[PDB]
Amino acid sequence: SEESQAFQRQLTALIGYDVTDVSNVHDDELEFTRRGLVTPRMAEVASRDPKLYAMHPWVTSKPLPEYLWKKIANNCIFIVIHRSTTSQTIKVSPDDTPGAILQSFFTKMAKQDFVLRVCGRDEYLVGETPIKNFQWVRHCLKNGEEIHVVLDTPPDPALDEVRKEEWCDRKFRVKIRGIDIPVLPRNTDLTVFVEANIQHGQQVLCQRRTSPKPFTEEVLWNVWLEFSIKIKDLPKGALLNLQIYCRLLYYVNLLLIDHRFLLRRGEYVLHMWQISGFNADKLTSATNPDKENSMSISILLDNHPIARAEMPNQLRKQLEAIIATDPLNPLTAEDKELLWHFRYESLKHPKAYPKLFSSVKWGQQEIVAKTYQLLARREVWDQSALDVGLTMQLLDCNFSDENVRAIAVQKLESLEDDDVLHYLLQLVQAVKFEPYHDSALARFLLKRGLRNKRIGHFLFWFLRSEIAQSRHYQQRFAVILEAYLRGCGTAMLHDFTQQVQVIEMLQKVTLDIKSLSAEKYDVSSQVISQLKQKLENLQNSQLPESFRVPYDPGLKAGALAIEKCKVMASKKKPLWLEFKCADPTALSNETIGIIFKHGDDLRQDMLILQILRIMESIWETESLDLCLLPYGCISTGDKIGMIEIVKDATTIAKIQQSTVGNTGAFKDEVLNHWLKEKSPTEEKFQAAVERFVYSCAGYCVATFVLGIGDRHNDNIMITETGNLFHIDFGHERVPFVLTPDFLFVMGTSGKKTSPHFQKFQDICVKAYLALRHHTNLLIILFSMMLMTGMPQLTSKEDIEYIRDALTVGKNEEDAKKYFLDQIEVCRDKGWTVQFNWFLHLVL
Ligand SMILES: CCCn1cnc(CCNC(=O)Nc2nc3ccc(-c4cncc(OC)c4)cc3s2)c1
Numbered sequence: 001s002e003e004s005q006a007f008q009r010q011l012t013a014l015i016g017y018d019v020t021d022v023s024n025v026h027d028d029e030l031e032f033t034r035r036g037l038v039t040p041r042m043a044e045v046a047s048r049d050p051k052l053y054a055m056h057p058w059v060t061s062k063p064l065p066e067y068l069w070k071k072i073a074n075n076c077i078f079i080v081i082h083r084s085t086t087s088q089t090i091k092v093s094p095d096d097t098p099g100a101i102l103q104s105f106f107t108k109m110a111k112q113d114f115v116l117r118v119c120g121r122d123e124y125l126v127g128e129t130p131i132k133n134f135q136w137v138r139h140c141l142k143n144g145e146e147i148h149v150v151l152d153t154p155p156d157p158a159l160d161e162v163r164k165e166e167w168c169d170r171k172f173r174v175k176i177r178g179i180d181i182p183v184l185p186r187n188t189d190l191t192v193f194v195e196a197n198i199q200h201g202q203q204v205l206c207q208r209r210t211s212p213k214p215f216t217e218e219v220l221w222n223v224w225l226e227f228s229i230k231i232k233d234l235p236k237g238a239l240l241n242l243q244i245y246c247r248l249l250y251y252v253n254l255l256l257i258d259h260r261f262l263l264r265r266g267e268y269v270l271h272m273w274q275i276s277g278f279n280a281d282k283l284t285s286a287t288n289p290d291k292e293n294s295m296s297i298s299i300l301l302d303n304h305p306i307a308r309a310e311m312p313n314q315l316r317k318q319l320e321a322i323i324a325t326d327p328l329n330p331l332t333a334e335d336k337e338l339l340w341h342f343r344y345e346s347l348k349h350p351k352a353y354p355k356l357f358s359s360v361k362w363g364q365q366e367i368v369a370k371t372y373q374l375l376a377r378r379e380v381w382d383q384s385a386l387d388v389g390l391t392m393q394l395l396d397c398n399f400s401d402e403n404v405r406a407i408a409v410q411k412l413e414s415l416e417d418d419d420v421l422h423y424l425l426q427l428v429q430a431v432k433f434e435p436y437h438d439s440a441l442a443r444f445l446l447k448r449g450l451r452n453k454r455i456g457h458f459l460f461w462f463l464r465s466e467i468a469q470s471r472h473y474q475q476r477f478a479v480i481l482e483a484y485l486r487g488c489g490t491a492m493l494h495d496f497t498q499q500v501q502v503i504e505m506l507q508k509v510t511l512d513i514k515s516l517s518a519e520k521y522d523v524s525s526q527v528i529s530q531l532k533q534k535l536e537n538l539q540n541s542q543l544p545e546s547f548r549v550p551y552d553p554g555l556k557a558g559a560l561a562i563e564k565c566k567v568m569a570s571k572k573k574p575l576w577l578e579f580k581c582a583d584p585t586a587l588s589n590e591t592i593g594i595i596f597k598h599g600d601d602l603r604q605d606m607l608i609l610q611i612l613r614i615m616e617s618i619w620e621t622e623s624l625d626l627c628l629l630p631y632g633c634i635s636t637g638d639k640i641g642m643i644e645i646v647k648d649a650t651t652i653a654k655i656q657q658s659t660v661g662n663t664g665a666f667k668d669e670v671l672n673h674w675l676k677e678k679s680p681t682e683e684k685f686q687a688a689v690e691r692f693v694y695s696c697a698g699y700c701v702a703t704f705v706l707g708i709g710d711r712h713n714d715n716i717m718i719t720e721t722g723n724l725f726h727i728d729f730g731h732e733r734v735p736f737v738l739t740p741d742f743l744f745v746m747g748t749s750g751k752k753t754s755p756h757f758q759k760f761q762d763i764c765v766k767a768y769l770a771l772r773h774h775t776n777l778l779i780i781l782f783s784m785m786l787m788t789g790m791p792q793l794t795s796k797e798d799i800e801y802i803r804d805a806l807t808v809g810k811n812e813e814d815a816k817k818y819f820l821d822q823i824e825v826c827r828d829k830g831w832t833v834q835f836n837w838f839l840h841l842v843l
Pocket of ligand 1: 727
């Protein structure tokens with residue numbers, strides 16, 4: 001039971017979806033999946049070390065990069081320690097463990113066991129890890145900052161307490177009975193038919209149509225559709241995709257083999273997803289909850305069970321060629337049969353595996369058999385070093401086979417939380433391509449999230465983001481989330497509970513303000529008053545005392561700095577909110593600044609940001625820093641989210657608006673003055689010039705690769721301290737933005753060269769060819785991003801942008817050349833496409 005039914009309401013209200021609800025299901029898969037997950041939850045709960053769990057030490061086995069060993073000129077590191085305005089600085093060896101450091105500290109003083117917490121954060125320096133390997137440390141040294149730690153006592157694991165739990169040979173065929181809708185769209189007499197496909201990872205196996213019939217609110221064929229495939233030749237995870245044309249208006253899917261390995265039988269009345277008017281919402285096994293407005297379709301099943309000599313030379317080379325080839329290069333029939341015939345050779349090359357397993361006639365019993373024997377002798381794959389790009393490739397929409405997919409997930413098991421975090425978002429999205437609710441991958445996210453509060457925290461927001469936006473996938477995700485929460489342990493349930501109230505509160509406010517200045521560029525006096533009064537109304541009895549900042553879970557925000565909060569001057573009306581630190585042990589009055597925004601789909605931004613982080617760590621692997629500023633951003637519901645404000649930064653545009661602020665002339669010297677005036681010492685200035693040259697360079701390459709490089713001034717920002725960065729990725733060309741104002745900081749004005757600019761192309765090109773060394777990873781992530789993150793998209797040309805840009809199949813010379821030309825376009829065009837935003841105000 002009873003007090004255990006509150007818990008459920010807690011869960012549902014925490015999730016944003018009621019998973020005990022059974023009104024949008026035609027079977028028990030979700031229920032079954034709720035049951036299936038108890039063990040892997042309990043298992044992981046049971047085996048986690050309570051102390052290290054409560055402190056969630058954020059840590060990495062990566063080597064410390066060159067550019068930070070450079071920053072330590074003494075093989076020794078300073079750490080200020082505090083007890084209560086009593087503090088001493090300690091020389092420490094980069095290889096010193098924390099316990100080891102406590103040894104030397106107790107030694108120092110008086111002439112039990114406490115723990116090193118970071119000043120101002122919910123971050124601890126604990127565990128047999130040399131300090132060189134805690135992230136905070138690496139982050140402090142990056143920025144030229146000191147390292148402030150208070151000594152306090154550990155958090156009681158009691159607070160992580162988890163609740164008690166006490167839980168034939170026949171051809172296949174389908175009777176299309178007919179379809180219904182209540183209200184008919186365009187109205188004038190058109191014509192309509194049903195298309196029934198037998199699908200397996202977007203490979204199509206058979207297809208049947210109906211004769212068409214006049215499009216009216218009710219249409220009844222009552223036909224058998226005898227397909228070409230044999231019942232027994234059906235593979236697990238095969239979808240019966242049902243589609244409607246007149247062209248494509250609606251689609252829906254049914255697993256032909258249920259989660260119990262049972263051929264699917266009987267009557268079904270399926271409510272169908274309308275078209276927007278390829279992508280991952282097409283694949284779903286879910287039905288439209290909206291029974292009242294959706295088109296639907298009746299059908300019937302009743303058809304039970306089921307569960308090397310020497311290769312030539314020039315063929316080996318055709319083979320190696322095929323294998324050695326981007327994920328988007330499609331395979332000829334000729335290729336596929338080659339791969340299949342020489343599968344045992346193909347098997348020694350882990351890079352072949354995606355190509356190889358998509359050369360499988362999955363519509364043949366006998367061949368899948370062989371394909372499993374093939375997976376049996378996995379020596380080489382098991383032993384290969386982890387390649388995430390490769391691994392990821394095998395979790396995309398192209399692979400429905402449960403066992404292919406699961407070897408990829410084997411490979412992830414060896415990732416440390418550091419990397420789990422990098423890829424967490426994409427991996428969560430990759431759930432959408434899983435044929436069944438319960439999957440190896442789902443279970444793996446579950447483990448890793450429960451094992452580590454950082455992953456757990458981000459897992460929560462990532463699943464919740466989707467649950468609240470997508471009906472296609474909310475059911476499945478809601479089940480995974482519920483699984484998580486039942487293991488994360490009441491500490492976090494309270495945290496998530498705080499957090500969820502705050503962002504529901506603050507979105508209420510966000511939307512109410514849009515109502516009050518329609519478009520009208522200016523923001524009425526009236527507006528700001530009301531914003532002020534609401535936030536005051538909120539703070540006085542309703543808002544929590546403090547709360548974790550979802551995009552950065554080490555930060556506890558306290559009260560609002562109402563004075564500093566405002567509505568932004570947008571066509572949308574985002575909030576500029578700022579909070580005090582709730583941590584009194586913090587080093588500053590410097591606020592936490594968060595922007596809330598409705599009107600853009602931030603799921604996209606989230607993705608782009610995550611790819612930015614990935615690029616930054618690729619550059620880590622060649623001892624390269626380009627100071628990208630992939631600020632925090634978390635989507636939270638329908639076209640609405642939050643955004644980390646970056647301290648001390650303005651808009652390239654505004655730096656123009658200041659001096660001239662014209663309707664839109666444009667000047668080249670202005671940026672460089674703006675730096676001087678924000679550099680209290682001329683040598684710090686050269687650091688701004690420094691940071692800028694990198695940041696510019698970073699964003700130049702990145703932005704180009706993603707093809708989001710032609711942007712307006714207003715959507716680029718720089719820090720008072722040189723760090724340039726792009727924003728707002730919800731929104732003649734130019735490849736990327738290299739305006740003449742930038743180049744004047746690089747000591748050039750219209751076609752010359754100079755110390756820092758030589759440096760600029762040097763870094764740029766380094767950066768560029770460095771990402772080409774991870775081509776397949778970027779291609780797979782990008783392609784997935786578009787499939788899980790976008791509007792509709794061409795399953796060739798939208799995606800194919802990024803191979804031409806990564807200049808696939810090219811030696812480093814051509815490529816370097818290519819990139820350099822992409823610079824020279826921005827110097828042909830100078831201010832031209834910048835200038836052009838304005839003009840089309842009327843075109
Ligand atoms: C953060 C504490 C207050 N503060 C301390 N220094 C400043 C100077 C002003 N700094 C900024 O405005 N920084 C910004 N950072 C971002 C990051 C992202 C976005 C953004 C990204 N995407 C979509 C957007 O549309 C609203 C906005 C805007 C800003 S402004 C403000």
